[PDB]
Design a protein around this motif. Sequence first.
Motif, PDB file in Angstrom:
ATOM      1  N   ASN A  81      42.006 -30.728 -14.530  1.00 38.66           N
ATOM      2  CA  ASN A  81      41.666 -31.665 -15.402  1.00 38.66           C
ATOM      3  C   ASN A  81      42.079 -32.898 -14.783  1.00 38.66           C
ATOM      4  O   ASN A  81      41.528 -34.397 -15.423  1.00 38.66           O
ATOM      5  N   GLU A  83      40.359 -35.013 -12.289  1.00 39.24           N
ATOM      6  CA  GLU A  83      39.089 -35.199 -11.713  1.00 39.24           C
ATOM      7  C   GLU A  83      38.107 -35.275 -12.774  1.00 39.24           C
ATOM      8  O   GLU A  83      36.540 -34.823 -12.332  1.00 39.24           O
ATOM      9  N   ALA A  84      37.965 -34.986 -13.719  1.00 40.83           N
ATOM     10  CA  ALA A  84      37.278 -34.714 -15.159  1.00 40.83           C
ATOM     11  C   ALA A  84      35.935 -35.161 -15.277  1.00 40.83           C
ATOM     12  O   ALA A  84      36.143 -36.908 -14.530  1.00 40.83           O
ATOM     13  N   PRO A  85      34.461 -34.456 -15.580  1.00 43.17           N
ATOM     14  CA  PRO A  85      33.328 -34.848 -15.187  1.00 43.17           C
ATOM     15  C   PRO A  85      33.280 -36.011 -16.178  1.00 43.17           C
ATOM     16  O   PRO A  85      33.390 -36.366 -16.645  1.00 43.17           O
ATOM     17  N   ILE A  86      31.475 -36.560 -15.472  1.00 44.62           N
ATOM     18  CA  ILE A  86      31.153 -37.969 -16.086  1.00 44.62           C
ATOM     19  C   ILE A  86      30.066 -37.456 -16.915  1.00 44.62           C
ATOM     20  O   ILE A  86      29.249 -36.319 -17.279  1.00 44.62           O
TER      21      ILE A  86
ATOM     22  N   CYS D 150      31.098 -33.256 -10.631  1.00 46.89           N
ATOM     23  CA  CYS D 150      32.594 -33.010 -10.283  1.00 46.89           C
ATOM     24  C   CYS D 150      33.005 -32.202  -9.127  1.00 46.89           C
ATOM     25  O   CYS D 150      33.321 -30.635  -9.196  1.00 46.89           O
ATOM     26  N   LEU D 166      36.243 -28.713  -9.125  1.00 40.66           N
ATOM     27  CA  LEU D 166      37.802 -29.257  -9.779  1.00 40.66           C
ATOM     28  C   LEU D 166      37.306 -29.096 -11.018  1.00 40.66           C
ATOM     29  O   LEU D 166      38.641 -28.273 -11.871  1.00 40.66           O
TER      30      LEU D 166
END
Lengths: 107, 571, 170, 362
Positions: A81, A83-86, D150, D166
């Motif tokens: 985690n 580059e954890a999502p948006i 991601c 990721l």
Amino acid sequence: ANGRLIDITENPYVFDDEDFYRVLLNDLIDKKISNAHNSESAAITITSTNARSNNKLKKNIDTKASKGRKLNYSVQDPIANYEAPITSGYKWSDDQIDEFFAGLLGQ
Amino acid sequence: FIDAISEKTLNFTVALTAGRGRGKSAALGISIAAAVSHGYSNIFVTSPSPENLKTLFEFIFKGFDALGYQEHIDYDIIQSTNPDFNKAIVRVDIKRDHRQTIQYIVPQDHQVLGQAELVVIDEAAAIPLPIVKNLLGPYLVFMASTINGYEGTGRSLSLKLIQQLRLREISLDEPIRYAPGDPIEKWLNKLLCLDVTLIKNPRFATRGTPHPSQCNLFVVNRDTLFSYHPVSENFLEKMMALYVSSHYKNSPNDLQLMSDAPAHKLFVLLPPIDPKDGGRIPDPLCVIQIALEGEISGDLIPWLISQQFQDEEFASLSGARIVRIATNPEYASMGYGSRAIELLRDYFEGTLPPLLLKLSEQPPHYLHYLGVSYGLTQSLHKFWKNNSFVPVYLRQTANDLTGEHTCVMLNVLEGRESNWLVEFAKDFRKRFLSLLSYDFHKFTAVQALSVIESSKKAQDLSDDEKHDNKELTRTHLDDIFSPFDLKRLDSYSNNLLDYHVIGDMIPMLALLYFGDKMGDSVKLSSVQSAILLAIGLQRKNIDTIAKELNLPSNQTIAMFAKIMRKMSQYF
Amino acid sequence: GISRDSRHKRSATGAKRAQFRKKRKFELGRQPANTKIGAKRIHSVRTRGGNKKYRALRIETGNFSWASEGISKKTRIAGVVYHPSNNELVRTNTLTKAAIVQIDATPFRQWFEAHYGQTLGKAKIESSVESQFSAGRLYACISSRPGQSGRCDGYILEGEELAFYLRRLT
Amino acid sequence: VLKSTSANDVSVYQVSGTNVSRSLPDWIAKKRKRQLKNDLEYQNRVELIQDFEFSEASNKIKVSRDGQYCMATGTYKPQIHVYDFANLSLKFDRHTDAENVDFTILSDDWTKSVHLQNDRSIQFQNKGGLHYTTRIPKFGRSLVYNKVNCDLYVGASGNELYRLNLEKGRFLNPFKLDTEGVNHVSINEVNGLLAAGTETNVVEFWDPRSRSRVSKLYLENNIDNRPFQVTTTSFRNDGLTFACGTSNGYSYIYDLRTSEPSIIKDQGYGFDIKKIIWLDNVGTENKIVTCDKRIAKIWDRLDGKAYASMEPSVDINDIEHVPGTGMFFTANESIPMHTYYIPSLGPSPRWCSFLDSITEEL
RNA sequence: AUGGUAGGAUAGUGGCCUACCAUGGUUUCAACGGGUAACGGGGAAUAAGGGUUCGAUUCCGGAGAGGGAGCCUGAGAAACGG
């Protein structure tokens, strides 16, 4: 599943007596070496070590999966985690881009 | 409102979009009373005009479910009475914050509203988007808006307001004056096309569409549009909602005015026509409504031309005024309007009747020129920059309701050339240079440079035979600047002169840089020239120019000295 | 930070990574110094006190031999077309050992005219190299390792060396 | 300093080039002794910019759009390098294993960095040093990252595109390629259209959420001396136009309206087309720059005419441009860095508030 | 993981690493696995001219210089002399 009979490493209805048979095939190669003194014995290692192999699919291994030359479907435990999502990062509403994907502006 | 009072959100943004029958006087009075009980000082009333804030104040403390509203005989209208909210020396908030303490404020003010703590704004969608951002800043502001009503905007302007945000928002649909679900009001909304469903359409929403190369810019008869067919009703309601979503204001009688206009026609841009089905109703890509002008058959283009100059030939010419031209509300990146403007230029350059009128099966009148009159928006100037509509006439007094000035543009979309358009554009170029900071002090410098580029492109346009400007003579340069000022400019070339000493000579230098004499010598036409135009023509300060150019260092001063030293080499 | 150490590996049985030391100065596994074609660049690297390795980063010419008479001149490089142990190394055009690289051996032709005096059909050599003196794109290998030599050396391919390698080209 | 144009009255200025030397090359070894031995009014007139030197500079240069930082990969030894425009020097230097032939950064100010080299190891590098090294099933030639959904994805010469999603810490979704051409990968920043550089001038487009491709394209030169690989692809920020550039020096500007042709221009040497950069963020829109090995050419995408051109003294293979500027970076194969400023293209940034002043008048 | 060859790297053999191949290698003569203040072993060392077998001599199991990460010069070194 029907209840007529999961760690597969102990299976009672499966009868693999390979453990003493591998000892017996170790007892085979010990006695066959001692009995191949003059010319030739019956079977020193032919279809004995191969019989160990083909039942375990000679080794059930892949050279590309060894080197990482094949893709690995396993979790790499540091890289969860950072580059954890948006949020919804599509600046359009994504259904007009479905029209763009159905009716392409190159096709 | 109580939840916003309890919360510690500094950006307490409350948005209230409602339909017909909202009870805005009771709703704002309830919010004012809640802000009276759990607020610091008061509520700053913000409206675009003298709206029903007094009725909101009449519904705050008094004013029960029986409202009893009146025009001028109400208790709030009369000032020589005791309205029982007379304050004294006490901690009461209803008596103190009352009709004697009406904190009304215009929405055009931004510094005083930013200094305020609690404010309430009504009909904020009518304000400009930068004006709404300056109004609805980081303070606690409650926003009230009306959707799909008379003298209001559409859901796309509300969606543009939502796109400006992202907060705490709510919606209301049920009427309060009557009850919701009234069939006569449903029939009245069907007759007046009050229902808006352009966003609800599944094919005419956004830029996701077919190619603009295969564009069907077909026509449609006004009587066929006036026919109450089921297919004709769905297309016209889609066409009316497209016109409603694009324009900010929406006159309720504008649809009847467009239908009854015999001198105004319309053309419908459509996507690539699928011949596999061919019979199902397709949603049009864009709608362009225009009208003719001249002395044949509503003459705002000719009245402005007569006000600008004495051109009876241009007054009697066959001019075209585009009333409205727009694609779908989120299809601004499609560029189909540019193809439609190309199609409109090509159209100038070559039971009942049939419903789908062919584009080729229509004889056009011998039009002299075309054009439109639009506001001074950067996107509208960008659409005109992609088009050939060079602006000439600009309204000096901006519209109070719109908040922006009106720009009238023309384009000679005919084989016949007159060269009066080129001559008037040079007059308009000289007029716009003089009108810079004479009345147009508060304007965008980049947009003014784009307007100057629009005038320069019209100068470089067709009918360029004997309208070429000359340079400056030695006697002409002597009358422009003194020899002591020329020696002062040499000191500016030595960089010992300050911005004050250079700024004195900047006035005649700015007119020379707009003139063709300096342009023939050199061309400093980068962003330094926009800083040069803003300092001289727009008369802004050095700090004001630096904030506008987003380069707040001394490089703005360095760019002006580089422009000045280039003029010193131009001697 | 690359490792050349022997204890990182598994045993003959496959012992489970006994973890005795960390990295020291002595087992310094250096970076792969892949080169390319272009104007010549030299790095001097000091290892073991007084041994000066020569890293060739860019190189433009080489000393390539022709074994049938035993001579070698200086030839300007053109580009690699095949490597046995790699394929994207060719697309990178990085010259390591045993890489089959094109040259325009004009002074080889100029020596040939200065030793024989006869044109090349436009004591003898076999016919499959007459296919490309007209093209002027002669094939040569790499003999020395360029990463530590700071030099490019090779030989021209000879007889069966073509007949096995254009077989591997196609 | 310099006034070198392309004979078009576009005053291109080049700073820290190979013509100018290091004005502080050796303060103790050389400059202390040669102060009296060389008055050197020309060398005192030499103005060093952002104060580093980078030998055999890079095969990959990058600038973060926020934080005002620069990224560089040295090749005398495999290097990774941080430079700060707010502090005008080497912020940080670290060695790495192999030469980073491709690289991508996280969206903000150098915090996390994804590296790709000659070997198949992907380097996730955080604020610390060398956080993790991975393995790729094929080799490495191209990689790119989407903050939406991601997922980085990596490809080099084969059949499966390795989507490094990721989230949940794996990599999945092997996308089926055609005839082993993926030599460049590209991103549509607004919608996530995929792009792959095929050896037979094809490009793919995939829906990432649907995990499926939608179409294929073909790029046909009218001359067509040889079949060619398209070498780079790029998507404009508006989500409309598409760019292609091949090994034959042919740059294609494809307006997406189902068009076989494009805006077609050929380079004067046609070695390759390395990178294509738009200039929509700066004014005077429809200007676009393509770079060969030995020429970078800014030109109008609608007029089809050349705006300007920058000719370096040595070959380059990367172009980086800070937005809002008239400023450019290169990764040359030599000891200086060619970086050049065009004031007509755009104004100077905040750290170069005096670089706009000193060379406009001199 | 075992070999083949090639390449990179090394002061250097080297699967040390990489590329592409062949699938193999260690075992009932015990491979792999559970116990050890292994302050216990080592002739490591004279002796103790009788303190039962040693009173005493020393090698000894590692990491580190606030903590990860990388670099640096020296026939010495991934330095606590950067």
